[PDB]
Design a protein around this ligand. Structure first.
Ligand code: HQE
Ligand code: HQE
Ligand code: ZN
Ligand code: ZN
Ligand code: ZN
Ligand code: ZN
Lengths: 287, 287
């Protein structure tokens, strides 16, 4: 209830500078790459083998997995600067602009701009531009830079809208069987973005493009954590709205997906992170 | 001190049956696959990126990483049967046999036999034969069985010998710069098996063949844990002999390799596991 996560657009200039510098330190020390690898490894961990569910996506654990992911990341931020918290990119609002690429989140003082097509869509502006921020490929080897390509896809030309977020919050059940890509009338699946996909969470990944557009490399872009902080906030709002609803499945789902199953690659269970306030943080809209 | 890890050949018939039962339960529940994935993920996590060091091999963390690996595995065994410990395969004495494939470890009541060449070296005997034990590939997808092919390689036709183990125990320094494949006069690198490789640990992997021969898939074979229990025992013996030698590097090595750096994919540091008795187990030869 103490750690306040703020909207990116409400950050001061010094708050933007401190977050950027912290992330750069976490990168130089070797800690940041641990989060890239964790996310990539979980994407390859199928529950069970044979299915297309994985520990972090395409199944009920999607939301609690990333909440724990962000929690660990934020603790590592504070270990460098105890006054830095994880902001969230409220992309729903940004979708109201006729050109979301002009949002202040993409300014040279924060996340940097779009990819440069002359340099094969390498990001050449901002603190994470090529030459200041090294990336790694699916195999864990250097890959030569951060790439982005805003809205260049036919499947995700725009960012999700406010209404899209509102319609997801109307869903009553957290998730439904068979707890995967095909779950209907499921808040988890809707928010993840497989209901007439790509929508919401999935659509944001494909809208940014570059590393963010594919699972094994997405956390190479620091905006991954800003994106998922907003996803986590939307989940927290859904939990507040539906006081008579809890995580699903409680039991008899695939191992790694139940309420008290460990989420690879950790021992953390969904129950451990079900109450985000108990984890020591809150979103600014909660005050 | 409480958990005693016994030589595989010293197990009773009921001790062999209980261990096999435990491993099968851990497999059915979905816990076993977590160890396959953890080991594969660490093999892809290079320290630093670009180099051929990884979190679990080809560097100083090789020994403490696998000790923590076995420690977690043994705790998961105990969770099922608090009287089941993890035995060790003393392959240096098996190498004394004119045909080590006749060793009792490969009996139908324990690990099962060699691969069947008629069946492309699929294991068709023992509790882990095809049809009774499913495997997964490098991508985390089912792979259709356990394969073995004893001594079929030109680089590892035999198991490491005893004198090999004795000559490794003579080394004074735990490890030397540059803390990788090329480390000379290094117990870690000799044990691991890159000094005139493949030797010792590396040679056993290549001698078994099949999944055991291949980094991302080796833990598909339950004998992986028996193999590394013997590697861990040899390390514990070296620590008793050289009681005033300690882990190296202490600092200024690659991140993830120092005495107090976290070992991906965990937060565990080498220091946390430097004293194996403090971890709650001992080898039978220590009594
Ligand atoms: O790592 C990723 C997971 C899900 C996505 O939709 C995109 C990237
Ligand atoms: O981590 C590993 C090392 C050697 C292998 O043969 C397989 C896995
Ligand atoms: Zn993802
Ligand atoms: Zn995502
Ligand atoms: Zn004996
Ligand atoms: Zn090994």
């Amino acid at each position: 209830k103490y750690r306040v996560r703020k909207n990116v657009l409400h950050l001061t200039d010094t708050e933007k500078r401190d977050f950027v510098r912290t992330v750069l330190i976490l990168k130089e020390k070797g800690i940041y790459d641990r989060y890239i690898a964790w996310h990539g490894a979980a994407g390859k961990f199928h529950t069970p083998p044979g299915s297309d569910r994985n520990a972090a996506h395409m199944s009920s654990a999607f939301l609690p997995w990333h909440r724990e992911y962000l929690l660990r990341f934020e603790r590592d931020l504070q270990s460098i600067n105890p006054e830095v918290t994880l902001p969230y990119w409220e992309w729903e609002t940004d979708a109201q602009m006729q050109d979301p690429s002009q949002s202040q989140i993409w300014s040279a003082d924060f996340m940097g701009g779009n990819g440069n097509p002359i340099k094969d869509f390498i990001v050449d502006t901002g603190p994470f531009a090529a030459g200041r921020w090294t990336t790694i490929d699916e195999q864990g080897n250097p890959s030569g830079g951060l790439k982005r390509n805003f809205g260049a896809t036919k499947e995700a030309p725009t960012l999700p809208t406010r209404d899209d977020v509102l319609n997801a919050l109307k869903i009553t059940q957290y998730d439904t069987p068979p707890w995967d890509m095909t779950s209907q009338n499921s808040f988890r699946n809707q928010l993840e973005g497989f209901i007439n996909g790509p929508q919401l969470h999935n659509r944001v990944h494909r809208w940014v493009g570059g590393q963010m557009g594919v699972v094994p490399t997405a956390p190479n872009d620091p905006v991954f954590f800003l994106h998922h902080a907003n996803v986590d906030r939307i989940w927290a709002v859904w939990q507040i709205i539906h006081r008579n609803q809890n995580y699903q499945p409680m039991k008899n789902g695939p191992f790694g997906q139940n309420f008290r199953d460990p989420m690879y690659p950790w021992n953390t269970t969904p129950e451990d992170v079900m109450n985000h306030r108990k984890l020591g943080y809150v979103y600014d809209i909660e005050l």
